[PDB]
Every structure is written in structure tokens, then in C-alpha cells.
Amino acid sequence: MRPWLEMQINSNQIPGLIWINKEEMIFQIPWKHAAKHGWDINKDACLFRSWAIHTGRYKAGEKEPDPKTWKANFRCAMNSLPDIEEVKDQSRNKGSSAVRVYRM
Amino acid sequence: RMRPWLEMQINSNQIPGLIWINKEEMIFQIPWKHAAKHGWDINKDACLFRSWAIHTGRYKAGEKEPDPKTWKANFRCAMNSLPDIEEVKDQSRNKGSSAVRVYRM
DNA sequence: GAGAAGTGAAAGTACTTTCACTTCTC
DNA sequence: GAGAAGTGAAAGTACTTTCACTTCTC
């Protein structure tokens, strides 16, 4: 009965993905819009990916790389969660990202 | 993009020919023969229960497990959840017994 | 008597499943 | 300018998906 979002990110920020616990409450998430030219699936759409294969939406070695979704699924999720509010001061545009507080 | 949900499946299912009635233009029955009673034929009791399981896709004919106990639970439980179908509960048990409900109008 | 069958409720994905017992049937 | 990508919210099975738009990026 594996973790649920507040966990997966909790841990996932505690290892080495690519964003931070820029605080001991708050964290970041690489929201590079994916039309920006410097967009590498393997560098931006990661957590997004981790989580989809984690939660079992996708499975590496699959034919749908579709990380747009991976992002939505992940966006929406982060939405729902009640113990992680995105500190809205940051609807970022370039060298962009989304920011949230974990409800303590 | 979805099929009907319980209040429908039964609505229709009582409007055809299964084995229970719209013993009213609000209320209906459901063959709850306990299944240890000796006169228990899967094909005669555990039907709707079945329709629904293969309907909702739980089972699909020709599948290694007719298990209609479940069919019954899945169906019992469901009927429970639904908010627009209240079983008028003051009812009968044992030997050709059935459950009765009103559809909230 | 006791093993198949049944439940409701609550926790998982608008029904389902699962949990934790509880009835039945002979 | 315009087409790929993004959204939030709401309706489907605690995330997902789907709806109905809306932003980006160059």
C-alpha cells in the first residue's frame, strides 16, 4: 500500500532529483514549460515521470512517453492534496517552477 | 464514455424480464434467496446480481469464477451507496423472500 | 455445529473492495 | 499568430480524467 503524494515528493526531495527543500517546510518543482526550447523530457518531466510510473500510470519501456500528462496527473494531484499548499507567489514563466508549502 | 449507473441498470432491468417487479410506480423487489436454501439455482436467483457484475464489467461470461456470492455483495453494497434508492426496510426474510425499495423520486 | 454465505461500514478507486464479524441452512 | 502545452475544477474511480478553456514560446 505504497506512499501517497505527500510522501513520494517528501522522499523525492530528500534524495537527488532536481528540485529543493528550499526550507524546512517548503519546496520547488521544475515546471519548465515544455515548449521552451531547452526542454529535455529526461531533465524536466522527471518527478512527473517518477510519479506516473510510481502510481502506476505508466511503465518505463512503454510506448506512451506522454509526459504532458505525467505533468497534469502530477499537477492535478499536487492540487488535491491537502497537506501541501502551493505558495501561489510564483506562476513562473521562464527558468520556471511551481512552489508549495506542505501543510504542517 | 460510461454506461448507465445502478439507478438505471435496475430501472431498466425491472422494466424488462428478469424475475422481480416494480410492485409499484416508485417501489420494487429483488430475489434475495439466501443461497444455502436448497432451492438455489445460480441461474435463477443470482441473476441481476450477475447481469450487473458483467455489466459493470466485474465478470465477463466464460471466466474462471462464477462467484455470485460476490455478485450479490458488489450488488448489495452498491444498492447501499446509491442515494436515490432507499430500501423500504421493514421487510421479509426466508423461503421465497425478497428485498423491497422505493426509488427516491 | 460449523462452514458456506451474508453483511455494513470504511477505506480504496459512485461504486468497489476489504475488514471484521455475523447469519444461515440442514 | 497559432499550435503545442498548460490549467483548474468537476466529475470519474485520493488521485485521475475529462471539460472547457487559457497560456506559452519563438
Q: Read off the CATH number of the domain in which A32 is found.
A: 1.10.10.10
Residue A85 has what DSSP assignment?
B
Domain count across chain B: 1
Contact (Cβ atoms closer than 8 angstroms) between residue B14 and residue B20: yes
Structural domain containing residue A16: 1-104
Q: Look at residues B96, B101, B102 and name the one whose alpha carbon lies nearest to residue B31.
A: B96
A72 sits within 7 Å of strand D by its CB: yes
Here the cell at position B11 is 430501472
Here the cell at position A90 is 510564483
- The three-class DSSP label of residue B72 is helix
Indicate the helix (H) or strand (E) that contains A10: helix A6-13
Contact (Cβ atoms closer than 8 angstroms) between residue A70 and residue A64: no
Resolution (A): 3.0
Q: Which residue is nearest to nucleotide C17 (CA to C1')?
A: B74
A57 sits within 7 Å of strand D by its CB: yes
Phi and psi for B85 in degrees, rounded to 5?
Answer: -145, 105
| Strand D, CB < 7 A, residues 78-97 of A | 79-81, 91, 93-94, 96
Å from the B66 CA to the D10 C1': 37
Residue A103 has what DSSP assignment?
-
Å from the A40 CA to the D11 C1': 33
Contact (Cβ atoms closer than 8 angstroms) between residue A5 and residue A78: yes
